[PDB]
Write a protein that binds this ligand. Structure first.
Ligand code: HEM
Ligand code: HEM
Ligand SMILES: [K+]
Ligand SMILES: [K+]
Lengths: 249, 249
């Protein structure tokens, strides 16, 4: 149900050049997880009923923010600002979603389709829309399903975004990587989740909730057994997330 | 542009009986200003663009709240709770707006028309929608005009709600009554505003802003000279406020 806007050839050229620059920058700076989180969090403020929030450039340097546990988003936007300045024609909204797409790609993840044309709108979303790491399956459905409009499949696949990166005690309070290879986009998140707690590795209560739900659990099993299937569902879910409220939502 | 819902005869009977009970209670308890503020603040959270917030029972005992400077709303709902319990058929939304209407009437104000049928909806509005007493004319238009959808005339007339009551240093931080007769609904708010500061009396920066605006100021002058005209415009504005998002907004 999407109808993507037309952008100029010059806009399209800037998207391609920015995509390359983002690859090199993100790879060199080792900041893929931070960038994926920035993109996903920006997009995740969308509420379908009111059609407010979503990936529309509302988070930017200097952030903003406020918003806690969390923290780190401020660093991400500052890191990207010099690069963004090289592409004044691009909206911040597009730039940050493209960074998220690139973050998945340069860590070896699937190639998430990207369509340009998001407009930067004046007011940021209200707070309290982000998921709470201490809560469970009902809460996940409230946030990703009732508010964002994503499916149960999307919830499990997107949770696999935790396959890269780590929590920090000075940010959320949780601490450490979900995986033994936290710069490699793979299905290890699901394998580690299944095998229970392991020293050095993190599981949020929100991750564990996937294990006890009769719909989520079989997907966790599927993804743990089949990385190709995880990649396919992940790319579909990330694309939908990145396009919430855009070109029809 | 209103189409009021049908309510049962029993509902209508409860409205009439509650209205009488509210008169006696509010008069005896000397809480008209607190009740007017409760009604007006509840209604004032409405945002026309998203059709969220408004007078829909979202503030209630035990409050809730949070929301500061402010404070006092908690007292108001607790005060009304035993009376509300005598009218289980009425929505809290209707009950609180009726209390606001009665508050104006028992202090000698105009008779604001009341239509029943507001439904109590699950989620409270987001915060930050209430007006800031330290700000000026542009801010008032942002809040009452852009968000609520009220006119410049409505803004000045409704500001006259300050003709009853007082600020408290432990609540907002401001202190004292706007008028020498703070339980009498009259046009004294405008007279005191015009005459400048007087010992014992309060003026918020938001009140003073009415004086410097080329649209607001002539209305302040008009209301100060003609209480009948103030009453007419006030009743119109209070009715609109009390019905935001209801029966079409
Ligand atoms: C399902 C609900 C989710 C919850 C409760 C949640 C919560 C969290 C928390 C608490 C952190 C730690 C932040 C810190 O301390 O630095 C974090 C980090 C992260 N999140 Fe999630 N998140 C969720 C969904 C997602 C989604 C859908 C994605 C992307 C598809 C994502 C991507 C990431 C990444 C990559 C990190 C690592 C950040 C870094 O390494 O600095 N998360 N998340
Ligand atoms: C125009 C923007 C407005 C601002 C900035 C504002 C601000 C305030 C503040 C700071 C207080 C003092 C609270 C305390 O310390 O106890 C107050 C009280 C009050 N407000 Fe307003 N208000 C506004 C509009 C209105 C409207 C539209 C109404 C009703 C029609 C209203 C009715 C009242 C009443 C009756 C009180 C006295 C409360 C008491 O005596 O406890 N106000 N307001
Ligand atoms: K990994
Ligand atoms: K008065």
């Amino acid at each position: 149900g999407k109808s993507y806007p037309t952008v100029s050839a010059d806009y399209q050229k800037a998207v391609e050049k920015a995509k390359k620059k983002l690859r090199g920058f993100i790879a060199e700076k080792r900041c893929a997880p931070l960038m994926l989180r920035l993109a996903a969090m920006s997009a995740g403020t969308f509420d379908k009923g009111t059609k407010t929030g979503g990936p529309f450039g509302t988070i930017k340097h200097p952030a903003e923010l406020a918003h806690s546990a969390n923290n780190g988003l401020d660093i991400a936007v500052r890191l990207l600002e010099p690069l963004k300045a090289e592409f004044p024609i691009l909206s911040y909204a597009d730039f940050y979603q493209l960074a998220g797409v690139v973050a998945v790609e340069v860590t070896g993840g699937p190639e998430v389709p990207f369509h340009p044309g998001r407009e930067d709108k004046p007011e940021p979303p209200p707070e309290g829309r982000l998921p709470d790491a201490t809560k469970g399956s009902d809460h996940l459905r409230d946030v990703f399903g009732k508010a964002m409009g994503l499916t149960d499949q999307d919830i499990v696949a997107l949770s696999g975004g935790h396959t890269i990166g780590a929590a920090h005690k000075e940010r959320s309070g949780f601490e450490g990587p979900w995986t033994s290879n936290p710069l490699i986009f793979d299905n290890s998140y699901f394998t580690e989740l299944l095998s229970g707690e392991k020293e050095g590795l993190l599981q949020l209560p929100s991750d564990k909730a996937l294990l006890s739900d009769p719909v989520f659990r079989p997907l966790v099993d599927k993804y743990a057994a089949d990385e190709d299937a995880f990649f396919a569902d992940y790319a579909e879910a990330h694309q939908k997330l990145s396009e919430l409220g855009f070109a029809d939502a």
